[PDB]
Amino acid sequence: MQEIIGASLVFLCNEKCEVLEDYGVVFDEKIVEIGDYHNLTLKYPHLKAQFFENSVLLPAFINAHTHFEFASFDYGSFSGWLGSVLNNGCQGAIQNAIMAQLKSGVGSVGAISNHLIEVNLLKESPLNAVVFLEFLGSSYSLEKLKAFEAKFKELKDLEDQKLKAALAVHAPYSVQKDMALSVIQLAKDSQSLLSTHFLESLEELEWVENSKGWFENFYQRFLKESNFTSLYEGANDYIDMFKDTHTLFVHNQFASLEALKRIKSQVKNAFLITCPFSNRLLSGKALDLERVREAGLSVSVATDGLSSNISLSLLDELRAFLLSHNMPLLELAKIALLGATRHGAKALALNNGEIETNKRADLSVFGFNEKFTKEQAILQFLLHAKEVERLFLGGKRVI
Amino acid sequence: MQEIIGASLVFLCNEKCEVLEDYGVVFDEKIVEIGDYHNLTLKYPHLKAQFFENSVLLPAFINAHTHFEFSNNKASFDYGSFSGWLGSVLNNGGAILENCQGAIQNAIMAQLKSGVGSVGAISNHLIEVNLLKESPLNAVVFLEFLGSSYSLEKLKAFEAKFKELKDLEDQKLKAALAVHAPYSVQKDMALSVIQLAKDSQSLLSTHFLESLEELEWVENSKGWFENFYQRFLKESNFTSLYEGANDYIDMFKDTHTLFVHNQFASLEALKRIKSQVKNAFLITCPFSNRLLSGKALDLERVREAGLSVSVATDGLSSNISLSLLDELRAFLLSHNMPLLELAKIALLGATRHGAKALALNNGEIETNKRADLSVFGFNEKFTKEQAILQFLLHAKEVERLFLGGKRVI
Ligand SMILES: [Fe+3]
Numbered sequence A: 001m002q003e004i005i006g007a008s009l010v011f012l013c014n015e016k017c018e019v020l021e022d023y024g025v026v027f028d029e030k031i032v033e034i035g036d037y038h039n040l041t042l043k044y045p046h047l048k049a050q051f052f053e054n055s056v057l058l059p060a061f062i063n064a065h066t067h068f069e070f071a072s073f074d075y076g077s078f079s080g081w082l083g084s085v086l087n088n089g090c091q092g093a094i095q096n097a098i099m100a101q102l103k104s105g106v107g108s109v110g111a112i113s114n115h116l117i118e119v120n121l122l123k124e125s126p127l128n129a130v131v132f133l134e135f136l137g138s139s140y141s142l143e144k145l146k147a148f149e150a151k152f153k154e155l156k157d158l159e160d161q162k163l164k165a166a167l168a169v170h171a172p173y174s175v176q177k178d179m180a181l182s183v184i185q186l187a188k189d190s191q192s193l194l195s196t197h198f199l200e201s202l203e204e205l206e207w208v209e210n211s212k213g214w215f216e217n218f219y220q221r222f223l224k225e226s227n228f229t230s231l232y233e234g235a236n237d238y239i240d241m242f243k244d245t246h247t248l249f250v251h252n253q254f255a256s257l258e259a260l261k262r263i264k265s266q267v268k269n270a271f272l273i274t275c276p277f278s279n280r281l282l283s284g285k286a287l288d289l290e291r292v293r294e295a296g297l298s299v300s301v302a303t304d305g306l307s308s309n310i311s312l313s314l315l316d317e318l319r320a321f322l323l324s325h326n327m328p329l330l331e332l333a334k335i336a337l338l339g340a341t342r343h344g345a346k347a348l349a350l351n352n353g354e355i356e357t358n359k360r361a362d363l364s365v366f367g368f369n370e371k372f373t374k375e376q377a378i379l380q381f382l383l384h385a386k387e388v389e390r391l392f393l394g395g396k397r398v399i
Numbered sequence B: 001m002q003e004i005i006g007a008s009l010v011f012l013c014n015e016k017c018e019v020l021e022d023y024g025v026v027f028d029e030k031i032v033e034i035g036d037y038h039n040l041t042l043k044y045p046h047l048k049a050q051f052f053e054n055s056v057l058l059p060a061f062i063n064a065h066t067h068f069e070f071s072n073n074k075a076s077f078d079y080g081s082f083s084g085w086l087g088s089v090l091n092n093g094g095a096i097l098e099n100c101q102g103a104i105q106n107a108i109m110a111q112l113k114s115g116v117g118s119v120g121a122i123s124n125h126l127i128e129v130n131l132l133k134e135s136p137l138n139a140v141v142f143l144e145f146l147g148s149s150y151s152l153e154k155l156k157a158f159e160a161k162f163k164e165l166k167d168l169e170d171q172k173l174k175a176a177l178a179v180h181a182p183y184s185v186q187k188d189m190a191l192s193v194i195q196l197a198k199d200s201q202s203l204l205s206t207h208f209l210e211s212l213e214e215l216e217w218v219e220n221s222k223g224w225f226e227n228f229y230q231r232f233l234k235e236s237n238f239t240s241l242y243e244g245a246n247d248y249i250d251m252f253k254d255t256h257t258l259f260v261h262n263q264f265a266s267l268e269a270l271k272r273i274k275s276q277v278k279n280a281f282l283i284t285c286p287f288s289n290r291l292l293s294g295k296a297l298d299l300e301r302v303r304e305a306g307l308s309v310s311v312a313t314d315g316l317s318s319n320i321s322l323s324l325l326d327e328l329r330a331f332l333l334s335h336n337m338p339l340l341e342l343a344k345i346a347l348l349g350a351t352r353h354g355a356k357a358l359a360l361n362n363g364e365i366e367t368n369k370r371a372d373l374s375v376f377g378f379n380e381k382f383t384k385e386q387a388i389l390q391f392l393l394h395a396k397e398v399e400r401l402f403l404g405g406k407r408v409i
């Protein structure tokens, strides 16, 4: 059926980043019409209508990078964290970790999975899911190459209207060149998305550029292989593999302006994803947001996983995103809201993240105790938003 | 009355920043002895003893700068600029202070449950003083002064309110005095406040160069403060009350002054504070800098000048939670320093550095110091090399809190 909802502040989440006051929207499975809440209640008098005063009505968030496979690990260094994850060499937390996204207002997630453990629970959840099956392998092996293209077939046999199948190549230090050319080709063949970790550390930059640094000893101590040279001969050699695709580039805190200009000019449809908290614990260098826009790209904000973070609430990761950059606060607060909405749905190629006609009815309502001023609404929301009062996904009431 | 407590990790919070494993402490009102927990249970067999596995035992925190009169403020004020925030605070005209004691009692619980045992509260009308007395917290009340025009009538209405403050002092509450800012207090109204602190032998706290608008005003009599005294203060002043940054600093020469914020003080300004205030204490509040000025304190400049920092929550006029732990994590995200070194500066800025600035006998697990101890329980046993930082990320609530050797939480 059809129903009307309106709040004292409505965040359209357009590229203009428009906030409207006392507006309402009518929706079924999709968003049909927008306008003033009172004028809408006269136009459609018989539709059920609810208004929320001193509340914010916005799109449901999109978390494009989150691993549900997970103290333990070491923070303060990337080498120390990777060493501590490999010195290590789940079903119940997964059913409660989805609940941490719904209550935070997240309606769509781009989850990276290695063994397809959480995909079954993501299907009964109301969440919009884009599972990237991640490929890990620094030695060529035709045997595992077909054991990975057979696990993807199990993913494509589980697709719905809520779960889309995608594929991921881990990092330039973990995947051999001819094993990624096959993964990338299968994504073109299956017409699915690509996610990848790119220049996340200073040690990976030293490794990819000049075959030096902490990675001389990585393949010997941890992988039982005898390799002492980089799998790729420079940063551009890794990028050109993703030419003419829809590739999600995560982190990129150590990619130079020439490197991101190359990503934009060559990948054609590249989407940079950033996770503020995980960069602090690991590499320690935050993403230069000016360099991002000096190259012509935009960022989405993601929680990453509890592999290198303390809370997977997208709102708490937004505040840490605000504290991590010296940009003018009120402009950067718009980069966060759009990086958690429209920019995250365009990276995942979904039909939500914006209050627009014919878009998915993925709506969040957040209740407060005051009415923020229109000039401050976007920033006051990010500081005080913690839980969600109402969450509508596909026009169905979930929370 | 003596008892024994030990944890898997013990943070001494000395300047060595020593982490010890399976250590214990014996305490009454003060800390008696430190050592290995098992050796302590044989030395003092009859003392009641509790051990906490996968826990951290450390001093109770010290929050040296927090306004409790403004705890009824969720939104209201404007963030993104200091001029925008001060304008919105003075456009409020002190209307958010009314009906506050119930919110004040809910901000006190945010310090105890976060592990804070001693706090340096800034007060203008002494509304929360009795609630701090009805509280287990160690209190250092700073009586704040606001007045940009000389008026000896208000000078004795302020020196009579201080006598009412010293008439409520005990061993739990110490009385201090505060000068607001170089933009809010006339020179001869602060020299009287400062002199009364010398007379009463009390501590001085002050907000110093917190904004870019405050620096241009103090240095060149320009910026957003040319029009400030007319719009909001109903006064006719168009030049700075002090003739340079050093003119405000030299008033605090030879005393015990807490300098808050100071994100816009240059190395020359910070070298002068140490050499001239003689016993100066820099206070920093990471989150309030982000919402207001937007510029974080240069911690490298702090150590290039020879000073150290303590971390304080400020008030909720410009903050979202007074859990000192949330402010420590925000302190970690706000500076680009090597994380593992900066995590010790955070722990010490919430402990030893805050108790010497507040002139208290705690903030360190040392013999003859106050038995102000906090116990935080976790699910893993951290490596000693990671313990200090892993504590800051996962600490949320406190398992046990002992203040003066008495069990509080
Ligand atoms: Fe990842």
Ligand SMILES: [Fe+3]
Pocket: B065, B207, B260, B314, B315
């Ligand atoms: Fe303050």
